[PDB]
Amino acid sequence: NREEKILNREIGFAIGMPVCEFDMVKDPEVQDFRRNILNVCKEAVDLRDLNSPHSRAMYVYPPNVESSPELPKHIYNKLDKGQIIVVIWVIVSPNNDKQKYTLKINHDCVPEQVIAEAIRKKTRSMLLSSEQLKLCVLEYQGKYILKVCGCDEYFLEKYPLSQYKYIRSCIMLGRMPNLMLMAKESLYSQLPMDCFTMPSYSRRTKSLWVINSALRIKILCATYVNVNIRDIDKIYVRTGIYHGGEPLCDNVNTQRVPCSNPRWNEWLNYDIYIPDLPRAARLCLSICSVKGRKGAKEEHCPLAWGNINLFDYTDTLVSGKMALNLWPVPHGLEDLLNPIGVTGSNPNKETPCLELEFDWFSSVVKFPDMSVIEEHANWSVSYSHAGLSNRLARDNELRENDKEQLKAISTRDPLSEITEQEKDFLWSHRHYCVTIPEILPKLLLSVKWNSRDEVAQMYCLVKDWPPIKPEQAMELLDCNYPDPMVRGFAVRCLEKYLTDDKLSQYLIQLVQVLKYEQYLDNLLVRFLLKKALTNQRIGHFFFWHLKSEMHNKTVSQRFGLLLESYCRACGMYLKHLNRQVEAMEKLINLTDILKQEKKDETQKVQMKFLVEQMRRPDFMDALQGFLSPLNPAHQLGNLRLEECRIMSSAKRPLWLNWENPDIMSELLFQNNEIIFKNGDDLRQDMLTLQIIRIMENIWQNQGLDLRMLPYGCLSIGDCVGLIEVVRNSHTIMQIQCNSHTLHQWLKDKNKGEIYDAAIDLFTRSCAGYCVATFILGIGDRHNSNIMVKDDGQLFHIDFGHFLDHKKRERVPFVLTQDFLIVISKGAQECTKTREFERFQEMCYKAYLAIRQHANLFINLFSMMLGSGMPELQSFDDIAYIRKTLALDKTEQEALEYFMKQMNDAHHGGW
Numbered sequence: 010n011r012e013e014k015i016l017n018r019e020i021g022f023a024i025g026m027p028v029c030e031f032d033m034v035k036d037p038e039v040q041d042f043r044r045n046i047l048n049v050c051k052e053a054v055d056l057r058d059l060n061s062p063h064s065r066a067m068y069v070y071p072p073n074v075e076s077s078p079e080l081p082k083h084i085y086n087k088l089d090k091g092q093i094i095v096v097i098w099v100i101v102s103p104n105n106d107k108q109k110y111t112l113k114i115n116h117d118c119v120p121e122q123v124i125a126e127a128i129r130k131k132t133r134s135m136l137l138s139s140e141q142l143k144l145c146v147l148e149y150q151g152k153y154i155l156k157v158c159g160c161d162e163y164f165l166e167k168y169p170l171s172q173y174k175y176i177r178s179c180i181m182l183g184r185m186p187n188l189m190l191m192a193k194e195s196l197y198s199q200l201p202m203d204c205f206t207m208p209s210y211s212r213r214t215k216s217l218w219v220i221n222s223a224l225r226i227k228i229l230c231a232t233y234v235n236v237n238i239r240d241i242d243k244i245y246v247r248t249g250i251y252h253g254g255e256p257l258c259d260n261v262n263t264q265r266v267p268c269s270n271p272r273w274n275e276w277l278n279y280d281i282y283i284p285d286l287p288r289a290a291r292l293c294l295s296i297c298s299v300k301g302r303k304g305a306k307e308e309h310c311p312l313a314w315g316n317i318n319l320f321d322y323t324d325t326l327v328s329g330k331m332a333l334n335l336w337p338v339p340h341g342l343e344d345l346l347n348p349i350g351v352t353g354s355n356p357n358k359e360t361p362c363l364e365l366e367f368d369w370f371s372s373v374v375k376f377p378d379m380s381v382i383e384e385h386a387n388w389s390v391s392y393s394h395a396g397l398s399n400r401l402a403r404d405n406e407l408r409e410n411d412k413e414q415l416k417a418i419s420t421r422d423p424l425s426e427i428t429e430q431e432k433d434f435l436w437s438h439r440h441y442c443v444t445i446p447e448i449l450p451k452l453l454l455s456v457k458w459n460s461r462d463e464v465a466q467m468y469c470l471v472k473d474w475p476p477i478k479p480e481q482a483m484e485l486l487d488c489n490y491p492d493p494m495v496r497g498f499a500v501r502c503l504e505k506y507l508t509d510d511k512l513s514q515y516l517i518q519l520v521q522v523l524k525y526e527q528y529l530d531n532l533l534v535r536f537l538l539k540k541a542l543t544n545q546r547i548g549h550f551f552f553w554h555l556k557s558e559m560h561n562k563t564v565s566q567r568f569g570l571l572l573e574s575y576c577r578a579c580g581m582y583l584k585h586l587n588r589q590v591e592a593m594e595k596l597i598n599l600t601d602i603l604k605q606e607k608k609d610e611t612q613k614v615q616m617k618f619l620v621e622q623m624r625r626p627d628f629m630d631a632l633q634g635f636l637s638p639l640n641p642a643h644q645l646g647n648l649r650l651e652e653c654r655i656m657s658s659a660k661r662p663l664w665l666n667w668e669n670p671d672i673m674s675e676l677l678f679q680n681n682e683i684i685f686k687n688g689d690d691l692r693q694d695m696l697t698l699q700i701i702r703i704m705e706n707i708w709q710n711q712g713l714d715l716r717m718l719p720y721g722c723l724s725i726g727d728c729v730g731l732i733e734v735v736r737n738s739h740t741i742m743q744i745q746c747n748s749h750t751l752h753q754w755l756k757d758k759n760k761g762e763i764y765d766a767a768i769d770l771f772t773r774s775c776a777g778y779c780v781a782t783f784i785l786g787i788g789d790r791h792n793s794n795i796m797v798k799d800d801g802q803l804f805h806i807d808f809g810h811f812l813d814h815k816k817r818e819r820v821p822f823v824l825t826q827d828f829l830i831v832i833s834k835g836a837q838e839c840t841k842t843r844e845f846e847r848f849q850e851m852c853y854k855a856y857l858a859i860r861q862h863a864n865l866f867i868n869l870f871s872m873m874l875g876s877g878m879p880e881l882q883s884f885d886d887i888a889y890i891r892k893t894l895a896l897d898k899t900e901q902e903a904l905e906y907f908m909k910q911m912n913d914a915h916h917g918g919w
């Protein structure tokens with residue numbers, strides 16, 4: 010009633026469009042999705058109310074843990090005899106006195122064991138309780154919970170203390186962990202119980218295989234096809250039947266008609282049997298122009314494109330009259346068709362519009378049930394009769410060379426081209442493939458999707474297919490794998506083997522591949538929403554990754570509806586997301602005014618305006634007392650306007666400073682510094698920074714302490730976003746204030762016995778960033794986009810473009826004598842040193858480690874193909890890292906290559 014209205018108003022502000030606009034959408038798929046997705050909402054809420062309050066605190070404050078408890082060789086070695094020193098703080102009776110208790114405990118100690126040990130140290134003063142009954146009422150560890158001093162991170166689950174990301178970091182960085190003992194009932198009360206309500210909208214035949222006919226589609230007429238008559242001669246419609254990025258038959262064009270009258274009334278006949286149409290078959294079309302000639306070949310140009318699914322969300326083969334509002338052709342489209350393009354009708358109806366008719370076979374035609382599929386697969390299942398086609402291998406036919414040949418095929422990278430000889434081979438030996446389940450993505454590409462008999466066989470193999478690694482399953486979710494039985498299996502592996510640490514790690518890819526789903530209601534959307542609604546850390550980024558694309562009409566309906574369902578069931582977080590949403594709004598409206606009206610003024614004038622505009626009551630209210638969209642465990646107190654400045658950088662970003670309202674702010678950072686950028690697409694920087702974190706985690710799990718700085722970066726909208734500020738760090742140029750200038754500065758900041766640890770950090774971070782940038786083909790490095798910390802850690806900022814920004818593999822990070830003098834610790838011939846010898850083997854061991862995990866990076870890039878990212882628009886883009894990692898070459902041939910690239914850029918040494 011009145012409360013539904015408030016909520017409707019609250020969701021409307023969060024997603025950026027009124028809920029009422031979803032109610033007017035006549036599409037049954039839309040209204041069904043809104044109503045039918047509500048069971049995920051119910052289930053998620055029920056799980057939160059299972060063991061209240063704890064159950065609800067786990068949702069709000071989930072454990073920030075690593076996937077594996079096992080501490081690597083070098084990490085366990087930082088512990089003194091396998092024991093970690095921790096500092097526990099108690100806020101005692103006001104004037105809120107902070108009292109510390111320093112403890113030495115095993116790294117595998119559970120938080121409850123730590124609370125007891127802290128109470129044991131605290132009570133030690135009263136020696137009466139020390140000897141007699143050391144217990145102290147079971148040391149009431151159920152009356153207290155651990156919190157991270159300085160931020161809203163809690164230790165609520167029975168995990169070894171070292172498995173917690175904060176504690177593992179503290180071990181690696183040589184920092185003492187400061188924890189705060191906070192009474193259980195004080196957190197539990199701060200949590201308002203959820204009152205999830207069901208919305209008002211929540212109330213409201215023949216089989217395909219019996220149609221012994223060829224497919225046909227009628228192409229009627231086109232409107233809103235406004236064309237300069239003087240240029241174009243004729244216009245025709247190019248059409249094709251696809252399954253993902255692969256055609257099921259040959260592409261059929263209509264007759265050419267004068268552009269003044271786009272009227273065809275033609276029935277287009279295709280090279281495909283109707284029972285032979287796979288589930289994910291789609292019609293792909295475009296309106297093309299043709300003018301010439303100069304006595305040469307005809308100048309074909311695609312005007313606008315569109316794709317329709319041959320079957321609707323209810324498995325119904327689309328029948329009857331239709332209208333498709335076409336889409337503009339994106340720059341550099343090498344084809345007349347756009348199969349990898351978004352499927353569906355353009356929301357703007359003032360765009361070219363193709364009117365079609367599909368066949369009507371006297372009744373509602375539907376895709377057969379699995380019972381009919383299995384009964385046509387068991388129905389599918391001599392010496393010279395099993396050998397009349399290279400797609401059948403009988404019993405007593407499996408060779409030991411074949412077993413190793415299939416094994417060799419499985420090793421090959423995702424972009425490694427399977428030959429047609431190799432496809433017939435994988436298909437004939439499909440039943441052995443179950444022994445090495447990792448072969449599935451290659452085997453699935455060996456299927457002739459245009460054959461019902463072949464596809465039905467594949468469907469049965471997928472049914473009883475051994476689950477694969479979560480990282481391995483993610484490929485089966487890219488554009489290449491449209492089939493629901495395939496994608497459903499991939500979701501099933503993630504549903505089972507994917508940790509919440511890894512879901513947070515790969516969330517952007519998982520949000521992206523959603524655009525490759527045929528329907529609004531699928532197993533991926535349900536998987537992701539459930540995780541978003543049972544973990545508020547995942548939930549936060551699901552919301553922001555989806556909100557940041559609401560300006561993109563290609564996805565705004567899917568995403569809008571997904572955000573509607575999310576906002577109804579997230580609970581209290583909605584009020585906090587709304588605060589962030591309003592904060593970001595005010596920074597966009599303000600940075601817009603500066604860019605449009607005041608760009609041509611002095612820093613002094615611009616700052617005067619900034620300060621005046623920020624001091625306004627409506628502004629001050631919105632921009633203080635909210636959670637950092639970058640890390641929502643960060644409270645952003647009051648603005649420190651005296652520390653807020655417009656940066657001299659390009660797009661003139663705002664450096665913003667907030668107080669940290671935590672009582673233990675001083676034990677983390679007393680002030681939160683975020684950079685607000687308006688003007689650049691922050692999406693490439695999110696992907697690079699994600700890849701850097703992954704490369705770093707790989708090296709750290711092999712015994713390579715090559716420290717990276719994957720700083721926070723979050724795209725919050727259309728070329729607007731947030732950048733984390735790396736505290737106490739300076740660019741190479743702001744160190745030059747000769748050749749020893751850098752080494753001089755580092756040696757100065759790190760004087761004494763702290764010098765030998767600061768040198769190692771430079772050389773190790775340098776080796777990591779040197780290997781990372783080469784492989785990735787990041788934008789060329791200079792004195793301004795290389796930064797150094799007052800401890801020794803080197804890192805890069807502003808990545809620009811990845812892969813081939815040129816359009817024949819570069820070394821973007823070339824080492825100046827400065828960096829090499831720090832490595833060789835002042836040495837004259839920095840080439841022939843014992844220090845550079847230890848640095849060479851760092852770069853070599855780093856490069857080979859990434860080579861081993863090539864298939865993950867290739868996959869993480871392919872999932873991101875859906876994104877409008879100009880440097881990631883084709884599989885020919887991702888192809889770059891297949892060159893840098895020398896995947897065709899051997900492990901020794903690849904090492905020689907890396908040395909040659911470094912040598913032909915640094916002019917020797919290696």
Ligand SMILES: CC(C)n1nc(-c2ccc3oc(N)nc3c2)c2c(N)ncnc21
Nearest residue numbers: 684694732733734735738740806807808
């Ligand atoms: C040069 C100096 C002021 N500085 N600049 C940045 C910075 C600014 C914008 C960016 O856009 C992207 N993509 N990466 C960026 C990095 C920065 C930081 N993140 N931490 C510390 N100092 C920093």
